[PDB]
Scaffold this motif. Sequence first.
Motif, short mmCIF file in Angstrom:
data_model
loop_
_atom_site.label_atom_id
_atom_site.label_comp_id
_atom_site.label_asym_id
_atom_site.label_seq_id
_atom_site.Cartn_x
_atom_site.Cartn_y
_atom_site.Cartn_z
N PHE A 1 -3.10 3.81 -2.48
CA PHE A 1 -3.54 2.80 -3.43
C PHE A 1 -2.72 1.54 -3.23
O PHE A 1 -1.68 1.57 -2.58
CB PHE A 1 -3.42 3.31 -4.88
CG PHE A 1 -2.02 3.65 -5.30
CD1 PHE A 1 -1.50 4.92 -5.09
CD2 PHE A 1 -1.21 2.69 -5.91
CE1 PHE A 1 -0.20 5.23 -5.48
CE2 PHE A 1 0.09 2.99 -6.30
CZ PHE A 1 0.59 4.26 -6.09
N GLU A 2 -3.20 0.46 -3.83
CA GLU A 2 -2.59 -0.85 -3.66
C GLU A 2 -1.87 -1.27 -4.92
O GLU A 2 -2.27 -0.90 -6.02
CB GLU A 2 -3.68 -1.86 -3.31
CG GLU A 2 -3.25 -3.31 -3.21
CD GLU A 2 -4.41 -4.23 -2.83
OE1 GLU A 2 -5.56 -3.76 -2.73
OE2 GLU A 2 -4.17 -5.44 -2.65
N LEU B 1 0.88 -1.17 0.00
CA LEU B 1 0.00 0.00 0.00
C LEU B 1 0.91 1.21 0.00
O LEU B 1 1.91 1.25 0.72
CB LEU B 1 -0.93 0.01 1.21
CG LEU B 1 -1.86 -1.19 1.36
CD1 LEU B 1 -2.58 -1.13 2.71
CD2 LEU B 1 -2.88 -1.26 0.23
N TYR C 1 4.25 0.75 2.15
CA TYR C 1 3.98 -0.20 3.22
C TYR C 1 3.88 -1.57 2.60
O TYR C 1 3.14 -1.74 1.64
CB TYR C 1 2.66 0.14 3.90
CG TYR C 1 2.65 1.51 4.52
CD1 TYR C 1 2.45 2.64 3.74
CD2 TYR C 1 2.82 1.68 5.89
CE1 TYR C 1 2.43 3.91 4.30
CE2 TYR C 1 2.80 2.94 6.46
CZ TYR C 1 2.61 4.05 5.66
OH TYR C 1 2.60 5.29 6.23
#
Lengths: 88, 94
Positions: free
Chosen positions: B50-51, B34, B75
Amino acid sequence: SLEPEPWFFKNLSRKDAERQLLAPGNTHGSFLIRESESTAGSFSLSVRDFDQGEVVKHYKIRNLDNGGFYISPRITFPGLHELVRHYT
Amino acid sequence: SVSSVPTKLEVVAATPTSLLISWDAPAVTVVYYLITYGETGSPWPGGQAFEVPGSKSTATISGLKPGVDYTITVYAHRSSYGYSENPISINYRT
């Protein structure tokens, strides 16, 4: 699906949440969950917080490809209940 | 000290309105990342997020207001749900 949960407020605008949370009776850190006008079929968390007046801070609940949710990318959850349990 | 996943992160291509970030493909398995970004000093989560899937090592951030200082943080999540690994951050003035 969420209708049974007391913390979920259905048909509640962002502005109505500001009024609801600022109304008397709400201690600091009073919160609710609403449907996001902000973003289509997703939810938002509104909370009572104080900014150097008292205020309502809105947080977007963002979705994962696996169906889970997060507010902060440091911690992710399978469902909202888990998120709400954690942030309480 | 304290070490992060991913270990290194840099901007490898800039336009005034967008950025391509790249990071070292980590040794341990990551299910997904993320990535937040926002003006340096934005609160609290840090801005838009966003992913990107675990297999990827690059991400493109766009729609940025030009000549503005942004913090960009990655992350890494090594299981479906739970705490992320120690994040990594960079600052970039577009």
